Amino acid sequence: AGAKDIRSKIASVQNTQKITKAMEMVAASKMRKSQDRMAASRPYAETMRKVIGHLAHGNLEYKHPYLEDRDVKRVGYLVVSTDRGLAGGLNINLFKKLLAEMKTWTDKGVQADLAMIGSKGVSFFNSVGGNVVAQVTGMGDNPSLSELIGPVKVMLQAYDEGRLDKLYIVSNKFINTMSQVPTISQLLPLPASDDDDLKHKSWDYLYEPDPKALLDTLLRRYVESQVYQGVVENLASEQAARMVAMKAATDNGGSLIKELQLVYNKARQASITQELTEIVSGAA
Amino acid sequence: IIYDDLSKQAVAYRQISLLLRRPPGREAFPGDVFYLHSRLLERAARVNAEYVEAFTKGEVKGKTGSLTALPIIETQAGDVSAFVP
Amino acid sequence: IIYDDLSKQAVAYRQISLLLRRPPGREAFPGDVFYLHSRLLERAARVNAEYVEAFTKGEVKGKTGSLTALPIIETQAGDVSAFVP
């Protein structure tokens, strides 16, 4: 206490308010760039899904494993998490939803399996004791598909090798700048769109060399693309969450300055009074 | 009975006291700034029927008088923790 | 030697000074409250063997003497700036 300590504390809180204002600005610009990098990713997945729609269950169809709902004896999850803190409640809401569903699956006696994108989830699920089999970390704000090839390779290999029976990606969904929602959604076996290529009756492809070898790579590339889109939406959501967190923190710093200054003024007045009284009432 | 400001009574007493060279205490209020308000507000009382009988020489029987006080105090910046409040 | 709360000897000396009408310093402490504690604490010393021989008139030779002091002070709200600390 005393005017000098409180004045030092006011100075430090003003500095904190500067820092958080700057972090809010930066997060807003990176949100814009990340939700451009997000929109740039749609065409690939959107056309590849129409190709698969025509080739898999169109006017002709095939019997690839990834398309059939076989019996669930254990599940795998791909978890997207940030690499950086100060993002608000994002990661923990996501992880609590994930744990709530993994609880059901393990109650039914089916095991669960995890592969981690980002280091926050890695540390968290190491602390909880989940089974993590593959991870990639330190992508930061520069996600690239060539890094996601590993962890999704592990899960696909373990799927068609018969050691999984369902595969999910769990990630946040960027909806509106002020709102973001965690979602667990399935990507194996392939979920069935209502797009009708019954109008495509009018034709069929020439397959070089044959359709069966092509459907396989199309499905693998499609799964990799959806995982990448999940990563990128989660990145834009991290930015849009850090923005609002830092806005709130700047307002809290501002509302705290106004209390520290009342305490400071009271201490200043008390010190003037005590000094001047000691002098006057000491003399004579 | 309503005292419209007992902060301004305290300030006027502080004036009268400092003009008499009396050493001040916290926030420059005199030593007996508590006794000032204490001996005032302690009169707002309720008294039993025997006190009323004895005081009024037996003219009033079985009634109990009372005086209810609502003092008003003004607090600078919402500080309920200063010497006079 | 462990002087317990020398911050309470300073208050006793302040009382004695203010009753003798001596000029009050900061926090009403007397002027020579530094000289009060200084000449107390400068007695805790280690003395060389020659001073001990001269003092004991030759009875003790070749031994140093020593007195160690551990005064205690109490600081209100971590204020090491106050006059006594």
One-character DSSP codes across C22-78: PPP-GGG--TTHHHHHHHHHTT--EE-HHHHHHHTTTSS-S--EE---------GGG
Residue of C28, C77, C79 with shortest CB distance to A278: C28
Q: Could you tell me which residues are beta bridge partners of residue A115?
A: A78, A134
| Residue partners of A191: CB distance under 8 A and separation at least 6 | none
A261 CB near a chain B CB, below 8 Å? no
| A281, B23 Cβ separation under 8 angstroms | yes
8-state DSSP, C79: -
C69: which 2 tokens? Answer: 């002091």
Resolution in A: 3.1
Distance CA A247, CA A239 (A): 12
> Could you say which DSSP state residue A135 is in?
E
Q: Which of A277, A279, A280 to mutate to test the interface with B (most CBs of B within 10 A)?
A: A277
Are A76 and A151 spatial neighbours (Cβ–Cβ below 8 Å)? Answer: no
Do A1-59+206-284 and A60-205 show the same overall fold?
no
Distance (Å) of CA A236 to CA A35, A80, C75: 6, 12, 53
Subunits with 3+ Cβ pairs within 8 Å of C are A
Instruction: Please indicate if any CB of chain B lies within 8 Å of the CB of A271.
Output: no
Exp. method: cryo-EM
Q: How far apart are CA A116 and CA A132, in angstroms?
A: 7
The answer to whether the Cα torsion of A141, A145, A150, A155 is positive or negative is: positive
Specify the DSSP element, H or E, that contains A113. strand A111-117
CA proximity to B78, closest of A142, C43, A265, C83: A265
Q: Find, in chain A, the residue whose alpha carbon is nearest to that of C22.
A: A282
Taking CB atoms and an 8 Å limit, are A270 and B23 in contact across chains?
A: no
CB contact under 8 A, A281 and B24: yes
Shortest Cα–Cα distance, C57 to chain A (Å)? 51
Can chain A be said to touch chain C, i.e. do they have 3 or more Cβ pairs within 8 angstroms? yes
CATH classification number, A1-59+206-284, choose in 1.10.645.10, 3.30.300.10, 3.40.640.10, 1.10.287.80: 1.10.287.80
**Whether the Cβ atoms of residue A120 and residue A82 lie closer than 8 Å to each other:** yes
| CA atoms of A220 and A152, how far apart (whole Å) | 9
Q: Does C5 touch chain A (CB under 8 A)?
A: no
Min Cα–Cα distance to chain A from B22, Å: 9
Determine the residue among B17, B20, B26 to mutate to test chain A binding: the one whose Cβ has the most chain A Cβ atoms within 10 Å.
Answer: B26
Question: Which of A241-259 are b and which e, b meaning 16 or more Cβ less than 10 Å from the residue's Cβ?
Answer: bbbbbbbebbeebeeebee
- Show me where the domains of chain A are located: 1-59+206-284, 60-205
Q: CB distance from B23 to chain A under 8 Å? A: yes
Which DSSP state fits A179?
A: E
Q: Provide the 10 A C-beta neighbour count for residue B48.
A: 9
What secondary structure does DSSP assign to A38-53, as a single string?
A: HHTTHHHHHHHHHHHH
Q: Decide which of 3.40.50.2300, 3.40.1380.10, 3.40.640.10, 3.30.390.50 is the CATH code for A60-205.
A: 3.40.1380.10
